[PDB]
Amino acid sequence: IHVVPKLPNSKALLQNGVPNILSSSGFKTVWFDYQRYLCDKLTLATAGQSLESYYPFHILLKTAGNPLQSNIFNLASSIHNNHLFVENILPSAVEHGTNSNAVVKTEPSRLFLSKIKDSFNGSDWEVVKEEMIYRAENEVLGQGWLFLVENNEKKLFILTSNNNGTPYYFPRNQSFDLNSAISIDEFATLKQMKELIGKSTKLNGKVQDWTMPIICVNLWDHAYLHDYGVGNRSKYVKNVLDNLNWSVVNNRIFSGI
């Protein structure tokens, strides 16, 4: 059985929500309700199968290449992504419930701001945040996820997913919406990706992708509607990126010590 993880300072979260992003009701929907909804469905889909003994991140990797297990993949991806979003927007990862700590001033580290300049042609963090807000509004018509990811070449770049698209495995990033029209450049990207997946010799037709997320923002209606309302998702993404917990985001960047 997949159970909803306990979050630090849960009593505060159930009373005052997440300050500056979500209220108490808004956080109950995104985490206490949606995470329960996802975990229960995942248990029903995976109970009695080998996947029950694997963590959601491992499940999505195992099922990423199986067309008829997409339902399990969607549930596993959403569960992992939701706890990645709830983790970097959380007031404090450490449990200051008995320490009553009210001073958590987390700021981008030097390694993070050095990789931003290197990968964005000298752009500042503030400018990159504006690009992230723009990318979310123009590339994710409906539900989806906004990620700041790092690849094998030490370069930080921005990835957007539609519905439950994993950042780890490019064949399932779901970054192009084929319901609408696509340019020849987007079709080339899809055609090139298909060729890479066909070069793999494995009988499971799986490729190697070492991309890892650094920041996760939930763009689903379960996170913003109640507090911001239809059409105000850009005000929600702005608040999230301005109140990130950088103790978690800094720890996600590999240092090598």
Partner 1 sequence: PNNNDEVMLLQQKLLYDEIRSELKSLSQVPEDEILPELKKSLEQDKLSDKEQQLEAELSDFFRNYALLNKLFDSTKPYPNLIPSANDKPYSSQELFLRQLNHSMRTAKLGATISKVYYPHKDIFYPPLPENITVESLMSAGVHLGQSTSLWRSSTQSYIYGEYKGIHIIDLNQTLSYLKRAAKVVEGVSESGGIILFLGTRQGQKRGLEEAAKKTHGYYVSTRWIPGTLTNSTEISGIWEKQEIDSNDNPTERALSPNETSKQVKPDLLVVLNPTENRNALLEAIKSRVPTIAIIDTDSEPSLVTYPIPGNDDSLRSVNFLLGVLARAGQRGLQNRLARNNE
Q: Of 62, 80, 129, 222, which lies in the binding site for partner 1, with binding defined by CB under 8 A?
A: 80
Interaction residues for partner 1, span 94-133 (CB under 8 A):
110
Site for partner 1 contains 191 (CB under 8 A): no
Q: How far apart are CA 186 and CA 76, in angstroms?
A: 27
Q: How far apart are CA 237 and CA 217, in angstroms?
A: 7
Q: Could you tell me the CA-to-CA distances from 224 to 18, 85, 230 in Å, in that order?
A: 12, 13, 8
Q: How far apart are CA 26 and CA 30, in angstroms?
A: 6
Structure tokens at 30: 């995104």
Contact letters for partner 1, residues 151-170 (x by CB under 8 A): -xxx----------------
CB atoms within 10 A of CB 106: 17
Site for partner 1 contains 10 (CB under 8 A): no
> Is the separation of the CB atoms in 74 and 165 below 8 Å?
no
Contact letters for partner 1, residues 238-257 (x by CB under 8 A): -------------xx-x-xx
Q: Which residue number, 42 or 133, has a Cβ lying nearer to partner 1?
A: 42
Structure tokens at 246: 């950088």
Q: Of 3, 94, 127, 141, which lies in the binding site for partner 1, with binding defined by CB under 8 A?
A: 3
Q: Which residue number, 5 or 142, has a Cβ lying nearer to partner 1?
A: 5
Question: Contact residues for partner 1 (CB under 8 A)?
Answer: 1-5, 39, 42, 52-53, 55-58, 76, 79-84, 87, 110, 152-154, 210, 212-213, 251-252, 254, 256-257
